Design a protein around this ligand. Structure first.
Ligand code: MG
Ligand code: MG
Ligand code: MG
Length: 536
């Protein structure tokens, strides 16, 4: 009979993104200067006879400035040289940076590089507590551990306590860099978010800074931002022409946040078509989610689920009027993808994303059934269903659609649920369940994962959320390990999965629902990435 009642916030943004006209003259000006600065930077990278520590800081600086996607060949060659030369005689600062940069790029450098900084007990020499730059680089490095790196077991706690201790008396911008590192490490942050912070709050205020790199980074950031705003304008126009804001009023209106997620998966210009496909899907499955999660009677969701499995416009008449709206929108979206990909003969690959979406919808229907029955499964059984309901198997598959170079063999690998994809999915699940345990346990929801975890192990909500946190930490060890050479597929198809995990950490930072309540977390990120340019 009657439905639930509306609890969701409206879009924060109105139509402020709907229209954006690129100032073409400015665009060409920026692009023209960048080409000159690009070659100056390349020559910095090819300069012969640099010290190890200077070469690492140059690579680090360029990566954090968001301009390393211009120099993948150069940076790879350099790190390849460093990996295969074994220079072990350096201080903590250089050693920890060396370790991090090589691991992030898939070079399996031994964690024994850290032996010289530990005593016979394997715990870090406390005499290092006053090397702030060394601690900072150790702190960052401690976040790329795999399961083989238990020698670094103490690195995070050791560096954290002493960085906290030093911070209030540090000079700027080092103090700000440390304070922000402690809030958000580099490895698990969204790359555009960290780049924007680094460029304007840190590097712009360093006395040592290289002016060519700073100017390069500002111009390149503001130039990509113009492309992002164009993309968001086109997606805003598509979303508005759908008009789910009035015809499907029960669902979250978050296409801007969805674009932010797509931007986190990749920011580079060559992934423009990919981002636009990805965001359309994210916002569309967000609708489907809210239909099971907050409007769908058990019967109604059954008709919807079967309709999705058969995947055929003939099925719309078995559905309620309001479900006809979302269902045809879904079917039309995939005919769109097919035509958009028809050009490059990449049309066939769409059925991979479709099959993964059928799978999501099947488990929405299960977990709905669990809530109406009030079933609290064992945690193993709960995860066996709740992993796919993250949508991360599905967004990961989708993310490949627009990538011009994704082949069938790539989708084939992704379909076998590889360990890197599984870890990213696990991180999303357990963090979502912690961040939104109350948000959901408001509406009498007893199907929550935490509740399963409490019932299963006979432990409190304390130990529950803890035990979930650990699964996230184990999963990060598996992501880091999935990045190491020889990689199963090209790094290009691993980075989107890594970035999915990063987006989880960033959106649900400090254990809050950042997607449903964007005001706290996501609004600042969106303003910094898509509203305000960097003051040049
Ligand atoms: Mg939901
Ligand atoms: Mg849901
Ligand atoms: Mg949830």
């Amino acid at each position: 009979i009657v439905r639930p009642v509306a609890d969701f916030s409206p879009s924060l943004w109105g139509d402020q993104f709907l229209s954006f006209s690129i100032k073409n003259q400015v665009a060409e000006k920026y692009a023209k200067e960048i080409e000159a600065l690009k070659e100056q930077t390349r020559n910095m990278l090819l300069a012969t006879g640099m010290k190890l520590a200077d070469t690492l800081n140059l690579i680090d600086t360029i990566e954090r400035l968001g301009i390393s996607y211009h120099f993948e060949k150069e940076i790879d060659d350099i790190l390849d040289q460093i990996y295969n030369q074994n220079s072990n005689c350096n201080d903590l600062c250089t050693s920890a940076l060396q370790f991090r940069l090589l691991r992030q790029h898939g070079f399996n450098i031994s964690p024994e590089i850290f032996s010289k900084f530990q005593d016979e007990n394997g715990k870090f020499k406390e005499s290092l507590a006053s090397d702030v730059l060394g601690l900072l680089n150790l702190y960052e490095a401690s976040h790329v551990r795999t399961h083989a790196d238990d020698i670094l077991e103490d690195a995070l706690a050791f560096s954290t306590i002493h960085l906290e201790s030093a911070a209030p008396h540090l000079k700027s911008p080092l103090r700000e860099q440390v304070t922000h590192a402690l809030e958000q490490c580099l490895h698990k942050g969204v790359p555009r978010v960290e780049t924007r912070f680094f460029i304007s709050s840190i590097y712009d205020k360093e006395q040592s800074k290289n002016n060519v790199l700073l100017r390069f980074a500002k111009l390149d950031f503001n130039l990509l931002q113009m492309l992002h705003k164009q993309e968001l304008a086109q997606v805003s126009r598509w979303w508005k022409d759908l008009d789910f804001v009035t015809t499907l009023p029960y669902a979250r209106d978050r296409v801007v946040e969805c674009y932010f997620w797509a931007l986190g998966v990749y920011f580079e210009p060559q992934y423009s078509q990919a981002r636009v496909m990805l965001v359309k899907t994210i916002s569309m499955i967000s609708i489907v989610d809210d239909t099971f999660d907050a409007y769908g009677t058990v019967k109604e969701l059954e008709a919807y689920t079967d309709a999705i499995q058969r995947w055929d416009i003939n099925e719309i008449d078995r559905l309620p009027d309001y479900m006809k709206i979302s269902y045809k929108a879904i079917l039309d979206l995939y005919k769109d993808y097919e035509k958009e990909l028809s050009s490059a003969g990449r049309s066939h690959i769409v059925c991979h994303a479709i099959e993964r979406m059928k799978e999501v919808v099947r488990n929405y229907n299960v977990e709905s059934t669990w809530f109406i029955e009030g079933y609290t499964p064992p945690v193993s059984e709960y995860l066996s269903n709740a992993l796919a309901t993250t949508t991360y198997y599905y967004l990961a598959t989708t993310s490949y659609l627009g990538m011009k170079s994704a082949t069938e063999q790539d989708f084939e690998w992704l379909s076998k649920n590889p360990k890197i994809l599984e870890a990213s999915v696990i991180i999303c699940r357990v963090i979502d369940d912690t961040a939104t345990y109350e948000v959901e346990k408001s509406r009498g929801q007893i199907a929550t994962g935490i509740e399963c975890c409490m019932r299963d192990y006979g432990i409190s909500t304390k130990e529950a959320m803890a035990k979930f946190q650990n699964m996230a930490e184990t999963a990060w060890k598996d992501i880091n390990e999935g990045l190491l050479r020889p990689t199963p597929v090209s790094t290009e198809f691993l980075t989107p999965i890594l970035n999915l995990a990063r987006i989880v950490e960033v959106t649900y930072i400090h254990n809050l629902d950042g997607y449903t309540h964007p005001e706290k977390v996501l609004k600042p990120h969106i303003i910094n990435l898509l509203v305000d340019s960097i003051k040049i």
